[PDB]
Amino acid sequence: TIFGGAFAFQGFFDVAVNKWWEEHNKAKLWKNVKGKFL
């Protein structure tokens, strides 16, 4: 019963943090840099 809210909070915080982290570190990630070294 409790697991529902816990999972909701986990998913919400995970998605928000991931989006913010990727946006803030954008230029420094491998995914965005690979194209230059292709």
Partner 1 sequence: EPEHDDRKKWGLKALVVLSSLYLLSIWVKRFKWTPIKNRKFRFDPP
What residues make contact with partner 1 under the rule CB under 8 A? 13-14, 17-18, 21
Q: CB under 8 Å to 26, separation ≥6 — which residues?
A: 32
Q: Which two tokens stand for residue 16?
A: 């928000």
The amino acid that residue 23 corresponds to is E
Tell the smallest beta-carbon distance from residue 17 to partner 1 (Å): 5
- H-helix segments, 1-38: 3-24, 30-37
Q: Which is nearer to partner 1, 30 or 37 (CB)?
A: 30
Q: Which of 24/36 has CB closer to partner 1?
A: 24
Closer of 8 and 14 to partner 1 (Cβ): 14
